[PDB]
Amino acid sequence: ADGVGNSSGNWHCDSQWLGDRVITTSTRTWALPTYNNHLYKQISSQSGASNDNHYFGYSTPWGYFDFNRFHCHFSPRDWQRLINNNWGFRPKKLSFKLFNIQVKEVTQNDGTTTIANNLTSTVQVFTDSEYQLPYVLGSAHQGCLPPFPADVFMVPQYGYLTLNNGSQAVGRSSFYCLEYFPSQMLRTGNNFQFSYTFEDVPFHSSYAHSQSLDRLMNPLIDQYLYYLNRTQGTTSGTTNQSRLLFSQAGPQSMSLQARNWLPGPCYRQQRLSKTANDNNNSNFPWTAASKYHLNGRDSLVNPGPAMASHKDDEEKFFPMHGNLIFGKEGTTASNAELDNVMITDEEEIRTTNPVATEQYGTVANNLQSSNTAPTTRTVNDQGALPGMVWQDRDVYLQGPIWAKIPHTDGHFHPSPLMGGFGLKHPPPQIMIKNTPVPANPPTTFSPAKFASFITQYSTGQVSVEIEWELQKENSKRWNPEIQYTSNYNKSVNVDFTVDTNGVYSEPRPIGTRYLTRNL
Amino acid sequence: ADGVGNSSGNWHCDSQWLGDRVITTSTRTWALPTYNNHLYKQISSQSGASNDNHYFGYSTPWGYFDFNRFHCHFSPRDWQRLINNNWGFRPKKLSFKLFNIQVKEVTQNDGTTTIANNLTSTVQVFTDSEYQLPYVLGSAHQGCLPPFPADVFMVPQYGYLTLNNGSQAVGRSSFYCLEYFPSQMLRTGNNFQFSYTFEDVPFHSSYAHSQSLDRLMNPLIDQYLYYLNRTQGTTSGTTNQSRLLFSQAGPQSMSLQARNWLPGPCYRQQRLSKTANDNNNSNFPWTAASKYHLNGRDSLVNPGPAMASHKDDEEKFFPMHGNLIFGKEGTTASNAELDNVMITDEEEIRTTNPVATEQYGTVANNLQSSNTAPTTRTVNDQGALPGMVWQDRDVYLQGPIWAKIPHTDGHFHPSPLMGGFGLKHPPPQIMIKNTPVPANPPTTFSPAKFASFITQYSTGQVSVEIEWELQKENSKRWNPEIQYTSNYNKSVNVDFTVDTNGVYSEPRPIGTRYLTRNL
Amino acid sequence: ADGVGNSSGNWHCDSQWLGDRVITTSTRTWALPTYNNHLYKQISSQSGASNDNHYFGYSTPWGYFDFNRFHCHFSPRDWQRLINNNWGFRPKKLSFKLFNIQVKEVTQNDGTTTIANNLTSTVQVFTDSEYQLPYVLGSAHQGCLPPFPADVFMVPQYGYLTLNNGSQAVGRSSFYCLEYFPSQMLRTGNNFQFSYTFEDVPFHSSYAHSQSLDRLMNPLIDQYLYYLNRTQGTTSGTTNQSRLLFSQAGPQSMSLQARNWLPGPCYRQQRLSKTANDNNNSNFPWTAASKYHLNGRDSLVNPGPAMASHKDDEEKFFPMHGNLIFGKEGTTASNAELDNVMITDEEEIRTTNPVATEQYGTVANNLQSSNTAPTTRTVNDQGALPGMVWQDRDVYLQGPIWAKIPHTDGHFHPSPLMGGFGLKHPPPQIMIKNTPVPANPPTTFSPAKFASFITQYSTGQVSVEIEWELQKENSKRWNPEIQYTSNYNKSVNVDFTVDTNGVYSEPRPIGTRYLTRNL
């Protein structure tokens, strides 16, 4: 509530480190055009497309604000500081502000274009706090507050999908008009505020394990429980006849002991060597990929269950569609090379989670007897058994922050398979739009739809602030620990900075799990 | 506590719709004979029966009252009203009343029979509130308060099973005498009251989903995560040599995106076409049916996990033993025709739950390399993985209401696989019985068991009342919704009414899931 | 805090039975030598050992106190009394005391040895209440308070493992120095006290089931739900053509009814007959055993999921590595005979848990049609499905009491697969050590490590006391129940006593599950 010559809000950014929590705030500049010429448009897949790539939905004239990525909040120094001293963290509070809003009209009369101020034009903004519109965040889409504060960004367009029977629709499909919501209209001088509180959520495990499930015992003392170790006879003359013999497992026969827990569930995936020539010479993806199909159409499990990337001393094999792959700065979005991308590694969970390329184990599948020898079968898909303990997938400075747990009758582990915190009531989606300004109407009344508007766009500043709780580490380890560092060697340009052309880049992915804990 | 000429209780029936809850009450007339001639009888399976159809137990002279079906409480108009405006519901409170009790003696001297009043005879009634007798409700048995209030019904006989080693018993087996319980004896003039409160239970999802798991994203914006899309070379001269290539999934390649969740667990079942000639010409049931065996004996999963009946545009295939099948009025209980039954459809859960006839997907099962091409295997049985989200089976106007969760150390999803609400402490079983009236004893004392009683039966009125909580719908859908209606076309008789012979019938099954929600 | 001639603490032992809880206390005498000559020693597996039997870790000069076994607390009469009247139990409170501590010096000058008092020598003791050192309890190791109170026992040595890449280590490995902890030093006259409270934990099911999952219904009343029972035609002339026919399942066709729940998850294991000649003539163990591998190395599931040992009337087959095996008194720890060990039976869970030797069932794996007949596949590995109900493994008088649930992001059923109660914060490990007493130092200062100490050991008394909650049984069973008893027949020596040589022995394993309950 001000005039045209008074600024609303200021540029805050920065971050504050307190005793048990950190407040990270960031401000950016945003631009917004008009979408679909102020029209809601039905969108069907295509005539003759693939059965799996079918979809029906709508596209609206509304934009929305995305900040669901760590790099859209944290900074490389702040991230390194957070992960090198903490065993966990989670969000606590959220604040959002829109200000310094300008609506600018555009005129075209020739090859040149002219831009002028339009002080009387409003802008509509509203937040879906009741979670009634479809939630499109948490799908790893583009367009959150660029990692560099100096970058000016663009508000993505909003759209949603619904039930479809092929390329068509069904009566059960829903249509949502976003103008049918109470929304706030604001001019140059007004501003929008919003506050939100996260619900209880488990701390993210920002640490590795210094122990292993299979090696969790005393290396000095035998077990007092007996196990069958021989079926033939040890004594002379009985080595060719059956006789059950029982031993006690000690430090030597350490693989035959009794145990309390089992490794996490498995869903096997194919393996690929980072060297091109070492792989099979065929286009096997989508024909040899672990995929799941529902309603008669297939789909690919890209993240999949949290499972270790490779074994020890491999460093060369990665599962097909088994880990997040990021893009380097200035990389094509279609058929990029292996050296132009950034494949994340989840080896830290080798201790608890089974490796993705290999199997869960073997199970007996017959009744052995004198005539028939015992036979087993390898099992590659494993559900949930009692006593199972596993670890969740790590999050990265560039990765997703949260997701919306679907409103369904059943859940097993609501932790998102792509990233961090799953929330029943996540931060609501803020949607912003430019109100349509009609051009000169006809002098004689006409009932026809008005389809001659004045072309104009908008720009402004958006501030976000999240308060995060931190879990401190108290480890009794004697020797030092592994931590994130910058290489001291000479380089043309330093990491996480701008080049001579002023383009910000991220060289490597950074994971949180660096400190250690005992199982 | 009254005389012989004063009535206890009245006929209430009807239902009341309040702001956030509905009170449904119904009164019926019941008859009760004497069972087993006032004797407890041991019952074994048979000599020479099938191994799977073996059982040992007891049958008592006690009846019991059953009202564990929606049609025994609701009415077609009330049911349609409930399901067309609500997103859920659950039971809150229960009241039960027995009154207007008459004991009538029967005399036979010739082909004719005479019935007289017997004012001094009592009736025993008691409720197992401590859950000590076996719970036989929740097994889809016959004999609850008929759907039509004017119908007079019959109290079913009580019996139970125990451990058996073949047709015989084991020392671990238990015997329960129901006369060994504190019970209330009541004459003509007395009445029995009972009140009960349901424990906390999740709301039943009386809605479908307007979105799908595989289509939950923005149809306009690409993903920023890379995925391997090619193994050969795209450039000329490299189409026959291996080279990993990575792309970004957008609206076109919508089946290759990253996702957070997986469809519910699966347990595959055989498929049957509703057309007889389209099926295989063999007696495959019980020889090609998904069955589970314990203690060395098999058993059939009739409901099975909640899984979609068929794909889109099928409308003709149903799983074998994969959905509830109801009987039409006046239908034989042995080898009825397909047109004389009523097969329920669970297609509403196609969005989340996998189809029953098809598989969960495929999983890689080898280590591909230059020499060996990758190989996958189809998986038809799937356990529980992290990130799994599913939906429960719908309930119907004629279906079961609740069940008793077994008292065991472990549970995964205590929702009954046949129907609605699972309860650790369900409504207790009320048991009623006619006390034995001896005939004239011998003049000289004899220690022999008294086995000459006076033949008589009982009749009375039973009132039930359940208070149910309701969850209102607040949807932002623009277009109208699908709802239950009666066909306006001319017909000989209208649905859910009596015919010229005064026989009440139910033409079709009615499911609760009609409104929609976003995932 | 006393002198040299005043005793600290007394010998309590005994047990008290109160209305709803039992307090079991026991005192023992312990001895303690010096370990590793007061040195921390790195321990690697070996050069050329098996890949699976690889390990890296450390061994310390510290002892620790173990009392994680029922026989180290209860007594045969107390155990029999507990299991013959109770439906459950769990720990409530813990108290621990160390007193009457003497440090004795040893001198060797010839074949003879002399032992003298050393009043000025201290002893170090501390409890890891913050759970920072690796937890080596709960691995079925040797050395808890002997079952007979008169036996004097030996304090086991402490050691731990860490991450290893083969026989070597990795930078992520941790080293813990136990001298780096605040510890209490105590002489002859001082004593150590400790108190602890268990966290909430489910009652242990010390009962069997009088009913079965597959037989949980009324043996007298048919079901009102129809099931496909025939695919051919029953009428004459249609027995060779397809026609779906539906029936109602009653007491006769009791294996084709509808049900609410499924048996627990399965993980098949091989079967062995107790008769040697009836088994296959090969050394199949470890080559036909259900095993799971992680980080590229295998491991054996000795307890495995809680699954029934055998079917009815078998009494001769046991799963390979599927139940706890105890040793008889004076039995060799390497290749003992079948008659010299004690194999526990878990048949009591046949009602709910599937048998270990057999499969979970069969699942359809194709689309049957006119041309192709339906085909099914047997499933031996089963995950977790909705509606699954199972039972946990029984505990024994000689078996483990508790275990430490690993600190991980995910758990399915934290009940240990080897035994009883899983605890996030179990009773902490008390560690005790003899401080090093230097021998005469050189007259001239030398910076070399001091490696000439005085040889001496320690002895003392340790008292433990646990308060346990009890769940009373209120069963309506008429006939008597099965209970534990001692055979009245004449014998050379009675059970659970000492022989002519004063050696205490345990003849048979005792399980808690003796009383019964309905599902």
mmCIF file of C-alpha atoms in Angstrom, chain B residues 43 52-55 58-59 64 69 130 132-136 138-142 156-163 165-166 171-177 180-181 265-273 276-286 288-303 318 320-321 324-327 331-338 341 343 357-358 377 380-384 390 398-400 403-418, chain C residues 203-205 207-232 234 239-249 251-263 310-313 315 347-348 350-355 358-377 379 381-393 412-413 471 474-482 513-519:
data_model
loop_
_atom_site.group_PDB
_atom_site.id
_atom_site.type_symbol
_atom_site.label_atom_id
_atom_site.label_comp_id
_atom_site.label_asym_id
_atom_site.label_seq_id
_atom_site.Cartn_x
_atom_site.Cartn_y
_atom_site.Cartn_z
ATOM 1 C CA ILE B 43 -17.970 -81.929 14.376
ATOM 2 C CA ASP B 52 -7.742 -79.083 2.114
ATOM 3 C CA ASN B 53 -11.393 -79.423 3.197
ATOM 4 C CA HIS B 54 -10.583 -80.723 6.671
ATOM 5 C CA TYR B 55 -11.792 -79.200 9.924
ATOM 6 C CA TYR B 58 -17.880 -77.803 17.894
ATOM 7 C CA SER B 59 -21.475 -76.722 17.308
ATOM 8 C CA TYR B 64 -26.077 -65.120 17.494
ATOM 9 C CA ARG B 69 -23.511 -55.609 6.199
ATOM 10 C CA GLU B 130 -13.944 -59.425 26.397
ATOM 11 C CA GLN B 132 -12.867 -64.700 24.530
ATOM 12 C CA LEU B 133 -15.020 -66.851 22.246
ATOM 13 C CA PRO B 134 -13.911 -67.293 18.615
ATOM 14 C CA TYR B 135 -15.053 -64.483 16.318
ATOM 15 C CA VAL B 136 -17.141 -65.973 13.496
ATOM 16 C CA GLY B 138 -16.612 -61.066 9.262
ATOM 17 C CA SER B 139 -16.565 -64.323 7.272
ATOM 18 C CA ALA B 140 -19.287 -63.274 4.793
ATOM 19 C CA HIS B 141 -21.811 -65.670 6.315
ATOM 20 C CA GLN B 142 -25.575 -65.520 5.889
ATOM 21 C CA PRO B 156 -28.249 -68.356 12.797
ATOM 22 C CA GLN B 157 -26.677 -71.119 14.845
ATOM 23 C CA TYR B 158 -23.262 -70.686 16.446
ATOM 24 C CA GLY B 159 -20.257 -72.944 15.961
ATOM 25 C CA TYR B 160 -16.491 -72.738 15.919
ATOM 26 C CA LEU B 161 -13.353 -74.530 14.755
ATOM 27 C CA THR B 162 -10.023 -75.327 16.384
ATOM 28 C CA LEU B 163 -6.669 -76.884 15.562
ATOM 29 C CA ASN B 165 -4.317 -82.746 12.548
ATOM 30 C CA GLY B 166 -6.283 -84.191 9.667
ATOM 31 C CA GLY B 171 -4.175 -81.494 22.685
ATOM 32 C CA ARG B 172 -3.697 -77.795 21.941
ATOM 33 C CA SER B 173 -7.333 -77.600 20.803
ATOM 34 C CA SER B 174 -9.766 -75.628 22.951
ATOM 35 C CA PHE B 175 -13.358 -76.227 24.029
ATOM 36 C CA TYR B 176 -15.637 -73.336 24.995
ATOM 37 C CA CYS B 177 -18.927 -73.830 26.831
ATOM 38 C CA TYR B 180 -19.952 -70.956 31.389
ATOM 39 C CA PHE B 181 -20.480 -67.194 30.885
ATOM 40 C CA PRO B 265 2.000 -54.557 -4.485
ATOM 41 C CA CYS B 266 0.787 -57.220 -6.893
ATOM 42 C CA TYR B 267 -0.288 -60.870 -6.698
ATOM 43 C CA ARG B 268 -1.160 -62.007 -10.201
ATOM 44 C CA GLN B 269 -4.408 -63.822 -10.959
ATOM 45 C CA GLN B 270 -5.764 -65.533 -14.048
ATOM 46 C CA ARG B 271 -8.067 -63.713 -16.465
ATOM 47 C CA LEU B 272 -11.524 -64.716 -17.704
ATOM 48 C CA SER B 273 -13.613 -63.246 -20.497
ATOM 49 C CA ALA B 276 -17.885 -68.350 -22.390
ATOM 50 C CA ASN B 277 -16.553 -69.359 -25.812
ATOM 51 C CA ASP B 278 -13.553 -67.015 -25.528
ATOM 52 C CA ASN B 279 -12.119 -68.956 -22.567
ATOM 53 C CA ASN B 280 -10.048 -72.128 -22.529
ATOM 54 C CA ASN B 281 -11.966 -75.410 -22.732
ATOM 55 C CA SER B 282 -10.867 -76.988 -19.466
ATOM 56 C CA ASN B 283 -11.741 -77.072 -15.770
ATOM 57 C CA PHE B 284 -8.733 -74.965 -14.802
ATOM 58 C CA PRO B 285 -10.098 -73.387 -11.568
ATOM 59 C CA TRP B 286 -8.231 -74.695 -8.514
ATOM 60 C CA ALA B 288 -4.606 -72.541 -12.432
ATOM 61 C CA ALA B 289 -5.656 -70.292 -9.538
ATOM 62 C CA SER B 290 -3.395 -68.133 -7.391
ATOM 63 C CA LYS B 291 -3.578 -70.027 -4.095
ATOM 64 C CA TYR B 292 -1.589 -70.060 -0.861
ATOM 65 C CA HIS B 293 -0.972 -73.082 1.358
ATOM 66 C CA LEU B 294 -0.112 -73.312 5.045
ATOM 67 C CA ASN B 295 0.327 -76.247 7.419
ATOM 68 C CA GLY B 296 0.443 -78.390 4.291
ATOM 69 C CA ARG B 297 -3.051 -77.519 3.036
ATOM 70 C CA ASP B 298 -4.032 -75.128 0.254
ATOM 71 C CA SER B 299 -6.478 -72.231 0.282
ATOM 72 C CA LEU B 300 -7.852 -69.826 -2.301
ATOM 73 C CA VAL B 301 -7.335 -66.057 -2.254
ATOM 74 C CA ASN B 302 -10.805 -64.969 -3.321
ATOM 75 C CA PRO B 303 -10.608 -61.192 -2.764
ATOM 76 C CA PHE B 318 -12.294 -60.123 -14.920
ATOM 77 C CA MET B 320 -10.484 -65.366 -11.471
ATOM 78 C CA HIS B 321 -11.248 -65.026 -7.756
ATOM 79 C CA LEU B 324 -16.694 -60.015 -4.837
ATOM 80 C CA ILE B 325 -19.554 -61.833 -6.570
ATOM 81 C CA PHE B 326 -23.076 -61.332 -5.233
ATOM 82 C CA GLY B 327 -26.174 -63.400 -5.959
ATOM 83 C CA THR B 331 -30.575 -67.752 -7.382
ATOM 84 C CA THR B 332 -29.318 -71.268 -6.727
ATOM 85 C CA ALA B 333 -26.303 -71.560 -4.437
ATOM 86 C CA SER B 334 -24.693 -74.332 -6.534
ATOM 87 C CA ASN B 335 -23.483 -73.843 -10.118
ATOM 88 C CA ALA B 336 -25.412 -70.700 -11.003
ATOM 89 C CA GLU B 337 -25.176 -69.107 -14.433
ATOM 90 C CA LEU B 338 -23.096 -66.039 -15.238
ATOM 91 C CA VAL B 341 -24.789 -63.316 -10.456
ATOM 92 C CA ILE B 343 -19.607 -59.326 -10.369
ATOM 93 C CA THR B 357 -4.452 -59.876 -14.877
ATOM 94 C CA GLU B 358 -1.135 -58.297 -15.915
ATOM 95 C CA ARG B 377 12.505 -61.301 -16.453
ATOM 96 C CA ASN B 380 4.186 -61.311 -11.341
ATOM 97 C CA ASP B 381 4.472 -61.418 -7.526
ATOM 98 C CA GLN B 382 5.629 -58.187 -5.881
ATOM 99 C CA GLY B 383 6.095 -57.471 -2.189
ATOM 100 C CA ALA B 384 6.413 -54.054 -0.540
ATOM 101 C CA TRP B 390 -1.807 -47.970 -3.223
ATOM 102 C CA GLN B 398 -24.432 -55.367 0.287
ATOM 103 C CA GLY B 399 -20.827 -55.950 1.359
ATOM 104 C CA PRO B 400 -19.211 -56.502 4.751
ATOM 105 C CA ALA B 403 -13.657 -57.508 10.496
ATOM 106 C CA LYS B 404 -11.563 -58.490 13.510
ATOM 107 C CA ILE B 405 -7.816 -57.956 13.164
ATOM 108 C CA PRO B 406 -6.196 -61.174 14.461
ATOM 109 C CA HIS B 407 -4.299 -60.861 17.737
ATOM 110 C CA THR B 408 -0.813 -61.525 16.366
ATOM 111 C CA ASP B 409 2.667 -60.086 16.755
ATOM 112 C CA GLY B 410 2.800 -58.596 13.257
ATOM 113 C CA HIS B 411 0.598 -56.714 10.802
ATOM 114 C CA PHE B 412 1.381 -54.936 7.535
ATOM 115 C CA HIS B 413 -1.897 -53.273 6.476
ATOM 116 C CA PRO B 414 -4.716 -54.319 8.826
ATOM 117 C CA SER B 415 -7.373 -53.245 6.329
ATOM 118 C CA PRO B 416 -9.470 -56.347 5.536
ATOM 119 C CA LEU B 417 -8.967 -57.642 2.007
ATOM 120 C CA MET B 418 -12.708 -58.341 1.668
ATOM 121 C CA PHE C 203 4.864 -57.860 24.905
ATOM 122 C CA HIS C 204 6.392 -61.146 23.791
ATOM 123 C CA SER C 205 3.736 -63.621 22.637
ATOM 124 C CA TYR C 207 1.297 -68.518 23.648
ATOM 125 C CA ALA C 208 0.247 -70.626 20.683
ATOM 126 C CA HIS C 209 -2.907 -70.251 18.583
ATOM 127 C CA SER C 210 -5.918 -72.519 19.052
ATOM 128 C CA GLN C 211 -7.233 -71.510 15.607
ATOM 129 C CA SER C 212 -5.780 -71.277 12.103
ATOM 130 C CA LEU C 213 -5.844 -68.605 9.422
ATOM 131 C CA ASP C 214 -7.370 -70.940 6.830
ATOM 132 C CA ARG C 215 -9.950 -72.192 9.376
ATOM 133 C CA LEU C 216 -11.360 -69.127 11.108
ATOM 134 C CA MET C 217 -15.033 -69.310 10.075
ATOM 135 C CA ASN C 218 -18.325 -70.955 11.009
ATOM 136 C CA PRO C 219 -18.322 -74.704 10.179
ATOM 137 C CA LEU C 220 -22.138 -74.671 9.867
ATOM 138 C CA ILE C 221 -23.174 -71.768 7.600
ATOM 139 C CA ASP C 222 -22.437 -71.253 3.918
ATOM 140 C CA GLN C 223 -20.973 -68.054 2.512
ATOM 141 C CA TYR C 224 -23.136 -65.646 0.517
ATOM 142 C CA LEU C 225 -20.327 -64.822 -1.946
ATOM 143 C CA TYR C 226 -20.108 -66.764 -5.201
ATOM 144 C CA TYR C 227 -16.941 -68.296 -6.621
ATOM 145 C CA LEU C 228 -16.128 -69.828 -9.988
ATOM 146 C CA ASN C 229 -16.009 -73.593 -9.430
ATOM 147 C CA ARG C 230 -16.364 -75.058 -12.941
ATOM 148 C CA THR C 231 -15.288 -74.044 -16.438
ATOM 149 C CA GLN C 232 -16.790 -76.963 -18.372
ATOM 150 C CA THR C 234 -22.186 -79.821 -15.815
ATOM 151 C CA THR C 239 -19.007 -81.433 -20.410
ATOM 152 C CA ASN C 240 -16.503 -80.830 -23.246
ATOM 153 C CA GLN C 241 -17.223 -77.126 -23.852
ATOM 154 C CA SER C 242 -16.417 -74.043 -21.804
ATOM 155 C CA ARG C 243 -19.104 -72.574 -19.540
ATOM 156 C CA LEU C 244 -18.384 -70.605 -16.368
ATOM 157 C CA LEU C 245 -20.281 -71.870 -13.316
ATOM 158 C CA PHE C 246 -20.425 -70.300 -9.860
ATOM 159 C CA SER C 247 -21.114 -71.918 -6.489
ATOM 160 C CA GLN C 248 -21.178 -70.942 -2.813
ATOM 161 C CA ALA C 249 -18.494 -72.267 -0.479
ATOM 162 C CA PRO C 251 -18.358 -76.435 5.244
ATOM 163 C CA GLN C 252 -17.629 -79.042 2.563
ATOM 164 C CA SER C 253 -15.802 -76.828 0.044
ATOM 165 C CA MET C 254 -14.039 -75.092 2.912
ATOM 166 C CA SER C 255 -10.845 -74.437 0.913
ATOM 167 C CA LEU C 256 -12.587 -72.203 -1.661
ATOM 168 C CA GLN C 257 -14.034 -69.544 0.663
ATOM 169 C CA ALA C 258 -13.202 -65.846 0.775
ATOM 170 C CA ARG C 259 -10.779 -64.623 3.428
ATOM 171 C CA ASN C 260 -9.399 -61.392 4.874
ATOM 172 C CA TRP C 261 -5.739 -62.152 5.618
ATOM 173 C CA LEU C 262 -2.684 -63.924 4.213
ATOM 174 C CA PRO C 263 0.143 -65.837 5.917
ATOM 175 C CA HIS C 310 7.830 -78.626 9.693
ATOM 176 C CA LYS C 311 4.303 -79.668 8.783
ATOM 177 C CA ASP C 312 2.021 -81.848 10.888
ATOM 178 C CA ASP C 313 3.078 -85.457 11.507
ATOM 179 C CA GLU C 315 8.622 -84.461 13.491
ATOM 180 C CA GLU C 347 6.009 -75.586 14.995
ATOM 181 C CA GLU C 348 3.741 -73.516 17.255
ATOM 182 C CA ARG C 350 2.276 -73.316 11.835
ATOM 183 C CA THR C 351 -1.137 -71.650 12.139
ATOM 184 C CA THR C 352 -0.005 -68.223 10.882
ATOM 185 C CA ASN C 353 3.552 -68.467 9.552
ATOM 186 C CA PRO C 354 4.193 -70.598 6.442
ATOM 187 C CA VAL C 355 6.379 -73.681 6.710
ATOM 188 C CA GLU C 358 7.665 -75.531 1.464
ATOM 189 C CA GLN C 359 6.567 -72.566 -0.679
ATOM 190 C CA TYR C 360 4.184 -69.658 -0.234
ATOM 191 C CA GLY C 361 2.013 -70.803 -3.138
ATOM 192 C CA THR C 362 1.535 -70.378 -6.875
ATOM 193 C CA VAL C 363 0.752 -67.383 -9.085
ATOM 194 C CA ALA C 364 -0.566 -67.258 -12.636
ATOM 195 C CA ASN C 365 2.073 -66.100 -15.110
ATOM 196 C CA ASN C 366 0.379 -65.951 -18.531
ATOM 197 C CA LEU C 367 -2.780 -64.865 -20.343
ATOM 198 C CA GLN C 368 -4.859 -67.980 -20.931
ATOM 199 C CA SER C 369 -7.101 -68.150 -23.987
ATOM 200 C CA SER C 370 -8.651 -70.689 -26.341
ATOM 201 C CA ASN C 371 -5.311 -71.580 -27.942
ATOM 202 C CA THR C 372 -3.106 -71.433 -24.826
ATOM 203 C CA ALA C 373 -3.930 -73.168 -21.549
ATOM 204 C CA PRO C 374 -3.310 -71.284 -18.288
ATOM 205 C CA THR C 375 0.079 -71.729 -16.630
ATOM 206 C CA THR C 376 1.180 -70.954 -13.069
ATOM 207 C CA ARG C 377 4.515 -70.702 -11.269
ATOM 208 C CA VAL C 379 6.763 -68.759 -5.580
ATOM 209 C CA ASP C 381 10.356 -65.901 -1.939
ATOM 210 C CA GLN C 382 7.519 -63.642 -0.787
ATOM 211 C CA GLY C 383 7.710 -60.036 0.360
ATOM 212 C CA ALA C 384 5.057 -58.100 2.286
ATOM 213 C CA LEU C 385 1.493 -57.785 0.989
ATOM 214 C CA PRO C 386 -1.463 -55.902 2.505
ATOM 215 C CA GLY C 387 -3.454 -58.044 4.904
ATOM 216 C CA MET C 388 -0.437 -60.131 5.924
ATOM 217 C CA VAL C 389 -0.434 -61.373 9.529
ATOM 218 C CA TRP C 390 2.419 -63.354 11.074
ATOM 219 C CA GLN C 391 4.012 -64.317 14.387
ATOM 220 C CA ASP C 392 7.487 -63.719 15.779
ATOM 221 C CA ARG C 393 10.121 -66.269 16.756
ATOM 222 C CA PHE C 412 10.094 -52.912 8.530
ATOM 223 C CA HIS C 413 9.710 -55.066 11.667
ATOM 224 C CA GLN C 471 0.638 -60.250 31.199
ATOM 225 C CA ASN C 474 -7.731 -65.121 31.051
ATOM 226 C CA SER C 475 -8.851 -67.940 28.755
ATOM 227 C CA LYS C 476 -12.333 -69.431 28.469
ATOM 228 C CA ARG C 477 -11.042 -72.841 27.390
ATOM 229 C CA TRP C 478 -12.858 -75.640 29.214
ATOM 230 C CA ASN C 479 -10.434 -78.556 28.938
ATOM 231 C CA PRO C 480 -6.973 -78.412 30.551
ATOM 232 C CA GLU C 481 -3.942 -76.975 28.783
ATOM 233 C CA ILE C 482 -0.482 -78.175 27.798
ATOM 234 C CA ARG C 513 4.767 -70.586 24.002
ATOM 235 C CA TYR C 514 2.651 -73.120 25.901
ATOM 236 C CA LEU C 515 -0.718 -71.438 26.495
ATOM 237 C CA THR C 516 -3.181 -70.816 23.672
ATOM 238 C CA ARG C 517 -5.252 -67.997 22.211
ATOM 239 C CA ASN C 518 -7.764 -67.546 19.412
ATOM 240 C CA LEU C 519 -6.779 -65.652 16.278
#
